Amino acid sequence: MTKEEQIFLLHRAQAQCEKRLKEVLQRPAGRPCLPEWDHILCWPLGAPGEVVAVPCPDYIYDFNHKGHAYRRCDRNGSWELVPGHNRTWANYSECVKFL
C-alpha cells in the first residue's frame, strides 16, 4: 500500500466517523463519552469510568491488526487527558512495533 492510498482510507474512515457522531447526537441517552476522530481511528461511545479498547484498525497497513488501542473514559463522560498535559490519553503501543 502506498502513502496516498493510505491517506484515502483515512479520509474514508473519517467520513464514517462523522456519520456515527452525527447519528449518536440524533439519538442521545445518558452521559457517555462521545465518538471522536483522532486522525487515526474513530473512538466509539465509551462507558463512563471504564477503559475503552478498540481493535487496531485494519485499514492501517503498518498496524498489528490483532492488538488494541486504549482510551480512558471518566465517570463524567469526557475522555481523560494525560496527567500533566492537555492532550487526550491514548495508548497505541499494541498497534505499532516502534512503541
Binding site: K3, Q6, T88, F98, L99
Partner: peptide, 21 residues
Amino acid sequence: QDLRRRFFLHHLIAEWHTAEI
C-alpha cells in the same frame, strides 16, 4: 512509497499515542 507510507504513520502515531508512558 515503501518508507513514505511508514514515515507518514510515524507522524500520526507521534501526536495518536499521547501516553508518553
